[PDB]
Amino acid sequence: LFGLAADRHLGAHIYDPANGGVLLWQHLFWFFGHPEVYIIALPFFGIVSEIFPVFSRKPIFGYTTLIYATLAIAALSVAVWAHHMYATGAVLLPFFSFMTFLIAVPTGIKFFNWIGTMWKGQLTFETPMLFSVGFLITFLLGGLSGVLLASPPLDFHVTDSYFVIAHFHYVLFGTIVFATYAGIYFWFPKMTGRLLDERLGKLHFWLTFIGFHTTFLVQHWLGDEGMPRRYADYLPTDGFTTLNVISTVGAFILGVSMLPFVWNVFKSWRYGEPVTVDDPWGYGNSLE
Amino acid sequence: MRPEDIDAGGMETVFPWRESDGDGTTVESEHKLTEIAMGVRNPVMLIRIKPADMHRVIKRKGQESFNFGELFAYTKVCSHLGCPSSLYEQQTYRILCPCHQSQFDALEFAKPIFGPAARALAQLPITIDEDGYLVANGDFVEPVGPAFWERKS
Amino acid sequence: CSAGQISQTTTQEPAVNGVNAQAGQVSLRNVHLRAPQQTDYVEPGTTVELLFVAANDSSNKLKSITSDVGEVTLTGDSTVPADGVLIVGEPDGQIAVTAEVELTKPITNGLLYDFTFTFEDGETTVAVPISAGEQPRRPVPPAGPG
Amino acid sequence: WSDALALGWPTGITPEAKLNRELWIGSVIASFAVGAIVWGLIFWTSAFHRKKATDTELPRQFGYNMPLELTLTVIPFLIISVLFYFTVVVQERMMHKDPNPEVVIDVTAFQWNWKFGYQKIAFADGSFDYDGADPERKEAEDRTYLNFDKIETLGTSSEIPVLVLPAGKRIEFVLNSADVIHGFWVPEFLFKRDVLPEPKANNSDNVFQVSEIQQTGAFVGRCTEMCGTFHAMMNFEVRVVEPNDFKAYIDQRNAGKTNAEALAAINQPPLAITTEPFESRRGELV
Amino acid sequence: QSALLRTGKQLFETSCVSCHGANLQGVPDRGPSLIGTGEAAVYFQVSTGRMPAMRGEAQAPSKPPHFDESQIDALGAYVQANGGGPTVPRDDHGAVAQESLIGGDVARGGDLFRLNCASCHNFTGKGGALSSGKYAPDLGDANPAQIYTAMLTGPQNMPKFSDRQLTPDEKRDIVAYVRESAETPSYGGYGLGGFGPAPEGMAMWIIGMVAAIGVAMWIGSRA
Amino acid sequence: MHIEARLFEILTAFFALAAVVYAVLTAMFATGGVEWAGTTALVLTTGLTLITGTFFRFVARRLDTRPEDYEDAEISDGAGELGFFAPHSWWPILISLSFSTAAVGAALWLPWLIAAGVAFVITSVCGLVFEYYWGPEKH
Amino acid sequence: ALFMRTELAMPGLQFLSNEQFNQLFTMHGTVMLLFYATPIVFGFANLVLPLQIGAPDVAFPRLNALSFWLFLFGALIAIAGFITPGGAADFGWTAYSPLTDAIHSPGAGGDLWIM
Ligand SMILES: CCCCCCCCCCCCCCCC(=O)OC[C@H]1O[C@H](O[C@@H]2[C@H](O)[C@@H](O)[C@H](O)[C@@H](O[C@H]3O[C@H](CO)[C@@H](O)[C@H](O)[C@@H]3O)[C@@H]2OP(=O)(O)OC[C@@H](COC(=O)CCCCCCCC[C@H](C)CCCCCCCC)OC(=O)CCCCCCCCCCCCCCC)[C@@H](O)[C@@H](O)[C@@H]1O
Ligand SMILES: CCCCCCCCCCCCCCCC(=O)OC[C@H]1O[C@H](O[C@@H]2[C@H](O)[C@@H](O)[C@H](O)[C@@H](O[C@H]3O[C@H](CO)[C@@H](O)[C@H](O)[C@@H]3O)[C@@H]2OP(=O)(O)OC[C@@H](COC(=O)CCCCCCCC[C@H](C)CCCCCCCC)OC(=O)CCCCCCCCCCCCCCC)[C@@H](O)[C@@H](O)[C@@H]1O
Ligand code: HEA
Ligand SMILES: CC(C)=CCC/C(C)=C/CC/C(C)=C/CC/C(C)=C/CC/C(C)=C\CC/C(C)=C/CC/C(C)=C/CC/C(C)=C/CC/C(C)=C/CC1=C(C)C(=O)c2ccccc2C1=O
Ligand code: HEC
Ligand code: HEC
Ligand code: FES
Ligand SMILES: [Ca+2]
Ligand SMILES: [Cu+2]
Ligand SMILES: [Cu+2]
Ligand SMILES: [Cu+2]
Ligand SMILES: [Mg+2]
């Protein structure tokens, strides 16, 4: 960023096309960009890993192995940065494809450990568990779509279209929406001393789930038919018109879904049910 | 000055000059050329409007013949407090005063559109002389400059 | 706020000392009259010149000018190619079709006079101005003491 | 049945596109399987393993299973290995670049339009030879990497540029940009590539070729790079015709026919039939 | 030159055709026609970097130039051959005149500037605000040819001064005043921007009063 | 503190391997040169972990087992004296405001604003550092 | 996102322009990623981590306070590009070059974004 400001304010000949700066900047940016997307993933893995054992009345299945999964995912997500640059035709294709395939192994381990945690135990499905399960369902399809992008032949046709937009709105909508809300519902009493409503926290979840799957599911098809991203408008004789209407309807549902949540937080912060115990969730494991 | 000197999208400042003054070489015409330049209500802005925009001009009910084709002349004194409102934007056709940020519409009869101004700028009728110089068809038909208690009818 | 549907920059007219009127599939640009003046009028009998450029975007069109200030006479091919233009007048500054006017009625700079341009498919009235180009300022006789 | 499994890809018009489509359709199935066998597991325990009426003690407290954890890191590894193998196989073929193209064309990308130039034509059976190379290119803000030809189609804000190519011949597609990065995408090709200002200095390969186009017709092409304001309004068309029509069109353009009446000379519509020029106005509120 | 007209046309169809038309006739609601503008307009708009423009806002800003002198001349000559208009003044060697544009009388230039140009621009040529999102820039960066060609053509909401309204002798004095008032050092200390009461007031509050209060706090006691 | 030290050198080893592999694989059969942009980053990413690993190794070998590092330690072993923590301070917001001023100055290229921002930053940092060291007033 | 989704349901440009749409998706993309998610990571950290490890406090509290204010003011400076007559950044969150050079995107919104 300092280098770019130097060019824009001093005329510093850093990112000149003649100077090989068109690709220098992309390398510099994508060394950041992908570790960034793994900065906002692992912490929200932690939340679900803390929520599963409590409501399952069973220990987290695999404690030693999850640490290694985290370490492997973090270490791998430094040498995978040019899989965002396929159409450029200027990177070593094999190097960034194999490693990107490899960064998909421990994620399955995490999934299977979660499934094994919630296996053969009494489950009650309060709001935290409902959100954390929605996380599983969304993130699986997100990751499945993400693996397809890793192969250069498929990214040759798919890249820079709404298929990728469909992808990173599932893998990103599970960690920082579903897991975030799971954490909020989990730790609200511990931080405030009040209990969030239950009949008002399930309407919110169902609205969010239905709205999200209504607005983002058809984007794969849009990108496949040949609709490019970052287009302001299109022509009537383009074919893709009705899918845009469906997406807009879903987006307005997803936008109205958030009223009950904010209402719940506003109402229950000072007139909520009082928790006077040390743990309102019963089979809590951690030291908080 | 002649109508040919100023082109479309230009503006000039003009003063009232009689044949009875002139040069300022002597001491008699040296104090007569100073009164013209120091007059409070003397300066006038002359603008030429593009022929393409001539179909969107609105007159002021008694000033329907105050222009010579595509040349208009208005007072350069702001009708708010008397600052020289002379920032002329020739694409938007707006006259801006740099004192209190009131702007006037040139296509209409210099009526205010923004700022603390409530009255329109005064117009001067113009024509040409037999030689081809610009002259006036008389003075304004209203007082020019800021207002006062016993102004208007 | 300034980058919406209505923009202050995209609607700006060119400062060219001339009109940019349209016609039937033909756009006329920089339409002006050359008439070097000496006094308040340019007297009838004198011949003056009409200048403009005609452009179309895709294969031919004929044309004819009529007016009320005398008669307009054309000389040249007076047809437009597919992706080309028709230049009639050469205004001062350029380094063959000509439009001459007999001017039955006197003209003066500052006013607009109606001209009718007619093609084989479209015809419009224009109301052209008079423009002086690279001509320097004409001398004004000095005054006296008063 | 393949329509509901390709998630709406266009069918290819070149062998490479068909091979890529084969790879993709084969991979979608391999990803739905592993999705189904995990959705089933999530659904199974969410409907059977619950808190029953009979309040028994806390369940079995098991937290480790070494054999299953060890046999679980190996099963997806083989799947990703086979996917990598097939990926390599397809990608090596899609970038062959045989050193004997039958027609080389130049593509240059500037601020919100396209421009095509026939660099050269050399048929494999000695039926037509032509060299449009025109050395006169000017330099300094250098802009000496750009290429100029004798026959060129220029795109305008009121006319979609149409490119005419023969059927059953190799196309060479040499790409350059003058100003910024743009995207050369043909959906029917199942292929796009970025066009960069200075490909040579940036260690980019700006040339790619296909074997031969199966069918004659008109196909759309869109810009995909986010090049600026009118980035959604930078389109072109490709019209593939018979070789004899190609030669007739070339001769007509060599006499000079603006690309609009050459098509009319070879009994083709003069304009684009896939897209039309965008309205010049900013929108409906003006 | 025939060879210079064709090199200026190939530069145009790659940069300018999108917003100005193939026949310089103008693309509606994107840009105006370029018939009758001349090479002075081209010189001013390309040398200062205003052209080519990148979006439609209240006012197109200035930026680094895209072309160099040869290319600028080619573009200017291509435009001049399509309707005529003003031309950039040259020197005895065929180059753009820079030194010859500086006039003799700075006082007459000064009082012409104060009457014609100080309303939009400042007393000495600083910025000034216009109606809505628009402004008059600083004059401290333009070379004599740029200053001359700015008021010959009329770029934007700035008016145009023809050679009959301001003769090409008064223009030289104006450019001399503009060039001199930008390279003269301040007398009496740091200039503080050259705007007047506002920077002076802020400097007072942020320096003098701060120092006085600090000294008072040092001398005095607390609680 | 051996676990902490080991966690860093594990990453050091991986990063070194990745950098070495990337550098060689691009020198051979890769258009251009070595791809200097990616090679540079990965040989300093390894250094990042190496510095911390070495420091942790030294600290671990210096001091013996702590209550934190003992499998079966009692709560009463930790009893004693923690250290110093700031109860409250309003200086952070002033530091942030100073930096924000400097940034806004640099964005619009207003050198006077930049200078004022730098002066404010220095003053605010001075205030923060000297907070718990100012003596009573001398009168 | 709601604005750009509303102006994406019908073929014609109804109420938006090109420039506005560009700035709109650019700023949506930046605000959602850098001013909501990356921060919300650290909100959950200094909410339960000291409780989880059994500590009374974080290592540096008076430095812990500075991070929040840096966040808030940086976010405000980046978002305040909409007050300018030009607008905010209109070149995506990715910020590819040369599109962010002085020649292309010469506005003041992009500068505030960077800083
Ligand atoms: C904040 C959350 C709350 C939710 C409420 C708001 C959220 C979003 C809703 C906003 C609506 C959509 C805006 C986007 C559309 C847009 O981009 O617009 C189109 C175009 O428009 C311009 O032209 C108009 C036409 O397109 C041209 O055809 C036409 O010619 C031109 O006509 C002028 O010009 C001509 C010459 O050309 C002349 O001939 C002619 O005479 C005239 O002069 C036009 O312009 P004009 O009429 O000026 O404006 C009209 C535009 C203008 O846009 C606008 O939305 C205006 C923007 C202001 C928005 C209102 C802000 C509200 C304040 C806050 C809520 C208060 C904060 C409190 C904090 C909380 C405290 C916590 C305790 O329509 C509107 O007002 C839309 C109405 C909707 C507003 C509703 C809000 C009020 C209700 C109160 C609710 C309170 C909530 C809480 C209470 C408890 C053009 O040029 C371009 O620019 C532009 O492209
Ligand atoms: C009790 C004590 C009282 C006394 C204190 C006084 C100290 C201050 C100065 C010291 C005294 C020296 C006397 C010698 C004077 C001298 O020999 O004279 C030099 C020349 O100098 C300028 O020439 C520049 C070039 O040399 C020319 O080539 C060029 O032409 C010219 O350009 C102008 O003209 C063009 C037309 O062509 C335009 O294009 C163009 O734009 C411009 O106008 C140039 O000018 P300029 O940019 O001013 O220089 C900028 C100054 C910049 O000053 C300043 O530090 C600013 C001082 C004022 C600050 C007060 C502002 C308050 C803001 C608030 C904080 C706002 C926010 C708060 C409110 C809200 C609160 C709530 C949040 O230094 C720089 O360069 C860069 C910065 C480095 C200077 C640092 C020294 C002091 C800084 C103090 C702190 C130290 C920390 C470390 C810093 C590095 C012009 O003046 C010329 O006349 C003048 O001739
Ligand atoms: C935000 C969080 C996030 C996460 C977690 C990820 C995770 C992954 N991403 Fe990334 N990605 C983004 C955010 C994220 N991404 C964003 C924002 C962009 C767009 C930026 C831009 O260009 O604008 C992007 C773009 C992006 C691209 C470039 C696409 C393009 O520009 O055209 C690629 C290509 O390789 C990629 C791949 C992957 C892979 C392989 C994973 C893997 O982490 C996911 C793996 C998950 C699974 C595999 C599912 C679980 C596994 C099992 C159940 C076992 C099954 C076993 C097999 C199938 C063998 N993503
Ligand atoms: C007309 C009116 C009512 C005023 C208010 C208008 C208004 C909306 C103000 C916005 C001003 C800004 C800062 C615009 C940029 C966009 C922006 C960053 C918006 C807000 C950002 C935000 C909400 C959060 C960031 C947090 C934060 C604290 C920001 C810091 C911003 C600051 C402190 C900037 C300074 C503000 C300001 C208006 C200062 C006026 C200073 C003046 C008048 C001095 C004039 C001055 C000049 C002009 C000189 O040339 C000069 C040259 C040499 C020495 C001195 C001077 C000098 O003093
Ligand atoms: C669309 C965006 C473009 C492009 C690609 C170019 N120009 Fe420029 N231009 C544009 C507009 C909307 C305007 C008018 C408003 C304003 O001046 O900002 C202009 C203006 C000019 C002028 C001034 C003409 C006048 O006096 O009437 C010139 C000489 C000019 N433009 C030249 C020019 C050249 C040579 C370009 C190719 C490099 C070019 N423009 C690109 C919009 C746009
Ligand atoms: C108000 C309108 C005026 C008046 C009366 C004058 N100028 Fe200036 N000027 C104005 C604007 C809005 C602009 C910007 C146009 C653009 O960027 O397209 C300008 C521009 C100039 C320039 C060029 C900018 C530069 O490179 O610094 C110059 C040299 C310039 N103006 C000088 C100038 C002179 C000498 C004037 C009186 C004789 C004058 N202007 C009047 C706004 C306005
Ligand atoms: S004096 Fe003109 S607006 Fe007040
Ligand atoms: Ca729409
Ligand atoms: Cu990636
Ligand atoms: Cu493009
Ligand atoms: Cu683009
Ligand atoms: Mg891309």
PDB file of C-alpha atoms in Angstrom, chain B residues 2-4 68 128-133, chain C residues 35-43 46 106-109 138:
ATOM      1  CA  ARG B   2     -17.935  45.521 -31.176  1.00  0.00           C
ATOM      2  CA  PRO B   3     -20.271  42.458 -31.050  1.00  0.00           C
ATOM      3  CA  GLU B   4     -17.633  40.478 -32.980  1.00  0.00           C
ATOM      4  CA  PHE B  68     -29.288  41.921 -29.017  1.00  0.00           C
ATOM      5  CA  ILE B 128     -25.695  48.658 -31.854  1.00  0.00           C
ATOM      6  CA  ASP B 129     -24.692  52.057 -33.219  1.00  0.00           C
ATOM      7  CA  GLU B 130     -24.617  53.000 -36.921  1.00  0.00           C
ATOM      8  CA  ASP B 131     -20.845  52.413 -36.900  1.00  0.00           C
ATOM      9  CA  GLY B 132     -21.197  48.934 -35.357  1.00  0.00           C
ATOM     10  CA  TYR B 133     -20.391  49.617 -31.686  1.00  0.00           C
TER      11      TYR B 133
ATOM     12  CA  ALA C  35     -18.905  37.463 -43.778  1.00  0.00           C
ATOM     13  CA  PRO C  36     -16.001  39.870 -42.982  1.00  0.00           C
ATOM     14  CA  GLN C  37     -17.730  42.984 -41.661  1.00  0.00           C
ATOM     15  CA  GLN C  38     -16.720  46.650 -41.932  1.00  0.00           C
ATOM     16  CA  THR C  39     -19.784  48.523 -40.613  1.00  0.00           C
ATOM     17  CA  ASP C  40     -23.088  47.898 -38.818  1.00  0.00           C
ATOM     18  CA  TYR C  41     -24.350  45.746 -41.723  1.00  0.00           C
ATOM     19  CA  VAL C  42     -23.192  43.565 -44.575  1.00  0.00           C
ATOM     20  CA  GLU C  43     -25.144  45.133 -47.430  1.00  0.00           C
ATOM     21  CA  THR C  46     -22.381  40.924 -51.321  1.00  0.00           C
ATOM     22  CA  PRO C 106     -28.556  42.539 -44.849  1.00  0.00           C
ATOM     23  CA  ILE C 107     -26.895  40.590 -42.028  1.00  0.00           C
ATOM     24  CA  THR C 108     -24.960  41.487 -38.873  1.00  0.00           C
ATOM     25  CA  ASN C 109     -22.916  39.584 -36.305  1.00  0.00           C
ATOM     26  CA  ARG C 138      -9.872  45.715 -36.070  1.00  0.00           C
TER      27      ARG C 138
END
